[PDB]
Amino acid sequence: TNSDFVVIKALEDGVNVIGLTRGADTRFHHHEHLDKGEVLIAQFTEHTSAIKVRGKAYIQTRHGVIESEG
Amino acid sequence: TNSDFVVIKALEDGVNVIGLTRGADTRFHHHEHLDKGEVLIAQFTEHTSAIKVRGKAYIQTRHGVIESEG
Amino acid sequence: TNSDFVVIKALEDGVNVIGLTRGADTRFHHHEHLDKGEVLIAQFTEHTSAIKVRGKAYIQTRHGVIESEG
Amino acid sequence: TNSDFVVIKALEDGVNVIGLTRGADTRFHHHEHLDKGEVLIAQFTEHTSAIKVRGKAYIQTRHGVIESEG
Amino acid sequence: TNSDFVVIKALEDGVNVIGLTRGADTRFHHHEHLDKGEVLIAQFTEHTSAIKVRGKAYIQTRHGVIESEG
Amino acid sequence: TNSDFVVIKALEDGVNVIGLTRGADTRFHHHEHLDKGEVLIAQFTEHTSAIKVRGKAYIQTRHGVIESEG
Amino acid sequence: TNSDFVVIKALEDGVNVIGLTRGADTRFHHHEHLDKGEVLIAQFTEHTSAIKVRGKAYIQTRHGVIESEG
Amino acid sequence: TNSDFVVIKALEDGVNVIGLTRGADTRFHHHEHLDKGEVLIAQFTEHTSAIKVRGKAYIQTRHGVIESEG
Amino acid sequence: TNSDFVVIKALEDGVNVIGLTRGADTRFHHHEHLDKGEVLIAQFTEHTSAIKVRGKAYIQTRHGVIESEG
Amino acid sequence: TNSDFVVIKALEDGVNVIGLTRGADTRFHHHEHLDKGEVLIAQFTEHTSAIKVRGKAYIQTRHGVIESEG
Amino acid sequence: TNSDFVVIKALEDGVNVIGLTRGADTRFHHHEHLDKGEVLIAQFTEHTSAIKVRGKAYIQTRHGVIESEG
Amino acid sequence: TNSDFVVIKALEDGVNVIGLTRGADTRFHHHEHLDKGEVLIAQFTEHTSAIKVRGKAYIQTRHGVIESEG
Amino acid sequence: TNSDFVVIKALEDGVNVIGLTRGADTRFHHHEHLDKGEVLIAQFTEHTSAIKVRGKAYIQTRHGVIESEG
Amino acid sequence: TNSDFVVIKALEDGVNVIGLTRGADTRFHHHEHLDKGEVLIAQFTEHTSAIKVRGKAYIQTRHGVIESEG
Amino acid sequence: TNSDFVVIKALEDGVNVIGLTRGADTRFHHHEHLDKGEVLIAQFTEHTSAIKVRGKAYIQTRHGVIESEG
Amino acid sequence: TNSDFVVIKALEDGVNVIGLTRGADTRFHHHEHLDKGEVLIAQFTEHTSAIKVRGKAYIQTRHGVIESEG
Amino acid sequence: TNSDFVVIKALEDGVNVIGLTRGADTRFHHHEHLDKGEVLIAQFTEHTSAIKVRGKAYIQTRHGVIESEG
Amino acid sequence: TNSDFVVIKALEDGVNVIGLTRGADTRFHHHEHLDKGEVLIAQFTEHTSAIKVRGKAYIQTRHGVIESEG
Amino acid sequence: TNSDFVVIKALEDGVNVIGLTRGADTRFHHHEHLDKGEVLIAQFTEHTSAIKVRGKAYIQTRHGVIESEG
Amino acid sequence: TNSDFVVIKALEDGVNVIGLTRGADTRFHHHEHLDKGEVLIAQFTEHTSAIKVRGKAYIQTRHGVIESEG
Ligand SMILES: [Co+2]
Ligand SMILES: [Co+2]
Ligand SMILES: [Co+2]
Ligand SMILES: [Co+2]
Ligand SMILES: [Co+2]
Ligand SMILES: [Co+2]
Ligand SMILES: [Co+2]
Ligand SMILES: [Co+2]
Ligand SMILES: [Co+2]
């Protein structure tokens, strides 16, 4: 349910990180803006079950490294 | 149950991700649209048992990497 | 009982994925149709114990990769 | 008691998979027919403690791969 | 929820480490200043769910090493 | 709510007819397979409010005749 | 719910007319066999919602005339 | 339900008209014999849901005229 | 259930009009004899559900005109 | 039961119009005499279910015009 | 029972219009005298079930136009 | 009893319209005077069951147009 | 008693529309003045049973169009 | 009292649409202003029994099309 | 009250559709924006008694077709 | 509230059909995506009062045929 | 809420002043017509929170003078 | 609500000053006539919220001087 | 909290004015559309705390004059 | 606490306006995005005590005009 995290590094100005709500109905719960060079370490919690990343960014997860260009 | 997640990156405009309900009767409970470049990190929960992906996409799971061509 | 999943990619149109009921009695409980190129990430739940795959498909499990040619 | 499974692929027409009942007395529980090319993913449960395979088949388990020639 | 930590080393003067709150609402909860050379070992707790790092820094996590340039 | 029906004739193999559930939440209810040449007469009821047709088919309604090319 | 009927004339031996059950669940509830030349005038009732016709037959409804070639 | 009727004229000796019961179990509940030239005007009721006609006969319904050759 | 009528004109001496009983069991309820040139206008009621006409006669119904030669 | 009527015009002296009773038993209830030229507009009621016309007369009903020659 | 009417125009002096009674027994309930050129619009009601017209008159009903020469 | 009306236009001075009462007894209840060129739209109501028109007038009813030459 | 309306267009200055009361006793209850060109759509209601039009006007009803010259 | 509507199109600037009260006393209840080109679809209700249109306008009703020139 | 709808197609960008409330008071309740090419099918309900259309649009109703130019 | 339906055929990929909520508040309640060639028959219910169509589509209603070009 | 006013002078015929309601919901509450040369002094009150001015007009407020060119 | 006044000087005979009511519903509550040369000092009060001036007049308020030409 | 206002003049067609909600959470509470030349005088109230203006407009506040070019 | 406001105009794309909470703890409470040209008029309230502006913007307060360059 918990105890797993992602590492997101912003490779450009204005990168959006959106957390979707946990439960029967899914809606936006929070978002964060990151500037060029920022690093965020985010954890899965009792109110967040999905994470969307908009903008150019570099992401590290247990399954490896990925790059978003949104 | 929980504590396991998939990583989906959209390689083209209009990628659809559909979540299926947990219980005896199975029916669509939510869908998400992804544009070219966006990344979604999704978790299995008490209201999601299966995940369906339509469109050209790149998927990372604990068992490896796969690509959907739909 | 839970917390393990399979990955199924349909290599041809009309692939059938059938789930069998958990309990003293056994019969069909649901099935899903997959079009060419689609990917399903399915789990094991309290109402499903066995999974049958009909049609040409590519399967990833904890024990490796297999190909069904039904 | 749970959380373990086997993967059986039928290499010929008419492959039989038999489940044996869990409890003080051991007795047949159900049988399944597989045609050439199909795949079954079967889990150990609280109503099934042993699994028997008749016919030419290819089996993947945690301990490796085996081939039945019955 | 717990039992995981990050290691941050400040590679320049004036590095800021910000902790975010665990709960229904997300709010800034605390920040720490690091001078050129200091090392902070920070854990995930019941009152913390995310950590942001502003400034040039070297970060070690379970998923590897990253560098923030901001 | 009742006393209205549609006539569907399958012009090709594998035509799918899907019923959508009546109520606050809209969800799949049942699907039917039609082979080349068969005819189905379906009625609107208190458990079905919408009907979806996939595949090459010929449809007669109170408003006239239509042809689906799916 | 009622008060509407269809006319089915069998143009060949062994024409099958199947009635599906009205309710939350759907399954076969009755079927009738028609010999060559026979005519059935069937209604819609509280236990029947849909009608399926297998075999070569001539059908008259409020929307016109159709021919099944199953 | 009621308030709808059919007109059958026998064009040969030995025409049989069979009525089917209204309810869950469908069952023949009565039959009538018609000789060459006789006319029967029959109505749908709370104990009749379907009507079957064997023999050479001329039938008039709200949807038009049909002829049975049985 | 009611409120519909037939018009019968006797084209020869001794024309018999028979009314069958309404209910689970069907038996003769009444009959009338008509002489040449006479006209009867008959209504469907709570005790009559079917009508037989024996002898040469001219009949008008909502569906059109028919001639009996019984 | 009601809400329908016939129009009878007497084309010769001495025309008889007979009403039959509505109920379990059928019995003559009333008769009327019409002279050459008179017009009677008669309704169907709770105490009448059939109408018989003896003598030369011209009759108009919802189904058209008829002539009694008796 | 109600809600229908006839239109009578008197073509000669002294035209009689007689209304018969509704119930088990039939008797004259009222009558009206019309002079040449007058027009009466008369409705079927809870106390009138049949209408007789004596005298030369022109009558319009839902079934058409008739002329009384009594 | 309601929901039906007539249209009367006076083609000459002094046209009288008389309304008759609804019930067991029938007596004149009201009259109206119309001057040349004037139009009255009158309805059948709970207290009116018949209408007389004296004088030269033009009348429109559901059954057509008539002219009173009084 | 309701659900039926008339359309009145005034073709000259000072056109009068008078409403008559619904009940045992009949009297004027409202006058309406229309100027040259105005259009009124008026409904039959629980307090109005007849409508009287004075002046030059054009009237549309279910039975057709009429001209008032009062 | 409901279930009937009018369609008004304004052919000039400043067109007034007035609704009159439903009941014993009749007074103004509301008005609407329309500009050159606007279309209003208005319904009869529990508080409106008449509608008056002032100004140049094009009106469609169940009885046909009219034009106001106020 | 219910059970009647209009079809509005936007022929240009920025078409406004306004619904007016049902009750003693009349107020603007909701509006909808339509862009060029969009079709809206709108029903009459318990909270809507009038519909106002601003902008160039094509409207279909039971009375025919109209065009707004606002 | 019920007993009416529309027929939508999708002439291009990704056609959106949106349903609006019934009540004092109006908001998006559900939507459906249609592929090129697919046909949806949709009914008006007690949770839906309006329908929007986005994309190139062909629509059949009681008032005729329309084409959306959104 | 009070103690503040605006001065509006009409520079042309037909100037409309509209007052909006104070509360959670916002609907038009009253409007006023001004002819050329006329002057209105209006106050903000417990029931008014906004004022719209349509038409060519000259407005004085505490912040200065403005001109509406509607 | 108080403590603010306007000064009105009449520049011609017959100048009208109209006071509007303070409350949910707005109506005239008082008219004042001024002759050529007279001066009125009027206060905003608990029963007056707006003031309308008709005629040629000179007005002084806190925002300056205005001239009415009505 | 109250007793202050802004003056907005629309310099172009389609200017949007949005009012945000007063309280712990901020959301769109109402909006208004302005056509070219219209003027709105808007007050701060117990349910509005912030105002956004989209579109070309001219704004007067206690701090001076500003022009929005959105 | 209240009764004072700031005026912010966005001079470039992507301007952020952040509100801080009133109470014992200071935390971010809300943010707003402004596009190039938009104007926001924001008040001080019971839930807000400070306002930060990120991005190129033009600000008007009681103390004068300021320009943010960030
Ligand atoms: Co944001
Ligand atoms: Co969607
Ligand atoms: Co299936
Ligand atoms: Co077997
Ligand atoms: Co027999
Ligand atoms: Co006999
Ligand atoms: Co007499
Ligand atoms: Co007005
Ligand atoms: Co809007």
Residue numbers in the entry:
A (entry chain E), B (entry chain F), C (entry chain G), D (entry chain H), E (entry chain D), F (entry chain 0B), ...: 3 to 72
Source paper text:
TRAP has proved a useful building block for construction of artificial nanostructures. The wild‐type protein forms a ring‐shaped assembly comprising 11 identical monomers. We have shown that cysteine‐modified variants of the trp RNA binding attenuation protein, assemble into cage‐like structures with Au(I) or Hg(II), called TRAP‐cage, disassembly of which can be induced by thiol‐ or phosphine‐containing compounds. Here, we report variants of TRAP which can assemble into TRAP‐cages mediated by Co(II) or Zn(II).
Based on the crystal structure of wild‐type TRAP, a histidine residue was introduced at position 33 of the TRAPK35C variant, yielding TRAPS33H/K35C, where the histidine and cysteine residues are located at i and i+2 positions of the β‐sheet motif around the rim of the ring‐shaped structure. The cysteine residue at position 35 of TRAPS33H/K35C was further changed to histidine, resulting in another variant, TRAPS33H/K35H, possessing a pair of imidazole ligands. When the TRAPS33H/K35H protein was mixed with Co(II) or Zn(II), it showed the formation of pseudospherical cages with a diameter of ≈22 nm, similar to TRAP Au(I) 24‐cage. We constructured a number of cages named as follows: Cages made with Zn(II) (TRAPK35C‐Zn(II)‐cages); TRAPS33H/K35H with either Co(II) or Zn(II) (TRAPS33H/K35H‐Co(II) or ‐Zn(II)‐cages); TRAPS33H/K35C with Zn(II) (TRAPS33H/K35C‐Zn(II)‐cages). To verify our designs, we solved the structures of TRAPS33H/K35H‐Zn(II)‐cage, TRAPS33H/K35H‐Co(II)‐cage, and TRAPK35C‐Zn(II)‐cages using cryoEM single particle reconstruction (see Methods for sample preparation and Figures S2–S4 for analysis pipelines). The resulting structures showed that these cages are mainly composed of 24 TRAP rings, and the overall shape and bonding network between adjacent rings is retained when compared to the TRAPAu(I) 24‐cage. They form two chiral cages, and each ring forms two metal‐mediated bridges with each neighbor. In the structure of TRAPS33H/K35H‐Co(II)‐cage, every bridge has in its center one ion in close proximity to the histidine residues introduced in positions 33 and 35 as expected. However, a closer analysis revealed that the coordination geometry is unlikely to be a perfect tetrahedron but rather a distorted one or an octahedron formed by 4 histidine ligands from the protein and 2 bonds with other ligands such as water molecules (which are not visible due to limited resolution). TRAP‐cages that possess only histidine ligands, TRAPS33H/K35H‐Co(II) cages, and TRAPS33H/K35H‐Zn(II) cages, almost completely disassembled in the presence of 35 µM EDTA (1 equivalent to TRAP monomer). TRAPS33H/K35H‐Co(II) and Zn(II)‐cages were more sensitive to pH, disassembling completely at pHs below 4–6 and above 8–10.
